[model samples]
Target: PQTDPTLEWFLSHCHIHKYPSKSTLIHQGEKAETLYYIVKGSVAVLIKDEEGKEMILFYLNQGDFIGELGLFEEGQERSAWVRAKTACEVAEISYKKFRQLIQVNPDILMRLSAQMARRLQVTSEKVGNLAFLDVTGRIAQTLLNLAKQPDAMTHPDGMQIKITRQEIGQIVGCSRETVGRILKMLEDQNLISAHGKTIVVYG
Candidate 1:
């Protein structure tokens, strides 16, 4: 009942497509021709540094926009990779279509601008965390962030975050084993419960 009218209009006009798990929706260094919006499932934002070390910057789930930041500038290359963490559906709008879109629906431009502000703020916070936080700190921060996502489930136990340790390692820029070790410590302290891929975070 409270869905964004712009998003509803977009879904009606855009090309809807489905991607399988691990699909590379947007490759880093590629030029953007179309803007994308997540219709279902989640995707990871990944980047490779100069040394070719792959890191997952973060995750985005349903209702988030993708590739909008680089869609306007002429021939702007993508700075990061967007891959489906699970089979997902997306809405696509070509550059030409996007131009036509804004002419008719100026609200979309406003939405994109708002999204840019939020995205930049997230990046700033992540940069600060990477520079200042220890492994344990990062892990805890990641869990708390995930739990706050709109799609996260909460029960009498706590907020449920459905993700694997390896994925967490990628986001934390550490090894899966290290993530597991620290997660074990967190579990021991009664801070969180891990049952395979699902983690129930307790306050």
Candidate 2:
């Protein structure tokens, strides 16, 4: 559903790759060499603190792209780890080829720039919420954000988001148990509905 001509042209020539579930595509602090555009299944962006516990940043399913940070910030190392959440198929484009593709198709730069900017804004908001919001407040915000993702399914009563409490804790910077407790509270209050893997947001 992307109307960007530049993206279509650039993706046309990219090589396809299949990654098994739970495989790593990019590691934190490693050299950024290629971009991955998911055509099937899903991936997760994660980072760890000093203790080495994985904190999921976000999920990328079909139609999502990653690894452009190095393109805009020359010599910049990767800031997070990208791992396959499911058996995923992606179009892989080398860093060099990406530059060439963008240069020839300048409009691609505009689309990427906008996409990057939007993510930056969301990142800022996430940081602010972590610094200021309470556990319940953060849980609410996280669910709201999930409900807006492209892969989310909206219904008459609520929106269904495919994510787990452990993953929500990563974004909220809390423990999975704490996320479960808050989810129970929300559900009891009729603010949300939990059906195993699908979180239904009433709001």
Candidate 3:
């Protein structure tokens, strides 16, 4: 049997998934067996609390990979949820095939590990912010982080981030009014400007 064909063999097969808005790609704490590669659109990584309140952690767009974590850890439960932020086009591969392909090309494994490490780091920072960052600190960091997402829409003078005040409050675990008050303070200082649903951060 030719092992070289294995790469070509697996590459020959691809199952594409088109996800509708608000559709789930990966569920938290569930067993998942496939790795998804985003070909178009975007996804939001989320976590739901005991009371079913969900917080959006981050967004991933085209060229981002997902569900590969299922490969490295045995009997691994998903760490968080992934949902389509927009209509998304994705290609999926079974864990068995993904693992086998990576064995032939160790670079893929390295890249996946790097991605995992960054996620872990961001998660840890978020936890730390929840514990120690005040409302002001949290909102400041949240805006800065949102400005850095993979598909951050930018402008000459500012970066356009399309998150509602209420959603910002959800991520910061505060009230919508509180988020508004803080943004006003920042605007007074010329740190940021918001109108409608778009918050333009002076980056």
What are the per-residue Cα lDDT tens digits for candidate 2 across 59-174? 77777778878876567789899999899998889888888887787776776687788778877887898889998999898899878877789787888887888888887888
lDDT of candidate model 3 versus the reference: 0.81
* Highest lDDT against the true fold, candidate: 1
In angstroms, how far off is 176's CA in candidate 3?
Answer: 2.7
Model 2 quality (TM-score): 0.84
TM-score of each candidate structure, all chains considered together? 0.85, 0.84, 0.81
- Order the candidate numbers by TM-score, best to worst: 1, 2, 3
Candidate 1 local Cα displacement, residue 22, angstroms:
1.9
Candidate 3 local lDDT, 103-164, one digit each (tens): 77776667668877888898898899989999999999999988887647978778878888
Write the number of the candidate with greater TM-score, choosing between 1 and 3.
1
- Which portions of model 2 miss their true places by more than 4 Å? 1-5, 148-157, 160-162
Error of 1 at 110 (Å): 0.8
Which candidate, 2 or 3, would have the higher lDDT against the true structure?
Answer: 2
**Pairs with steric clashes in candidate 3:** none
Q: How should the candidates be ordered by lDDT, best one leading?
A: 1, 2, 3
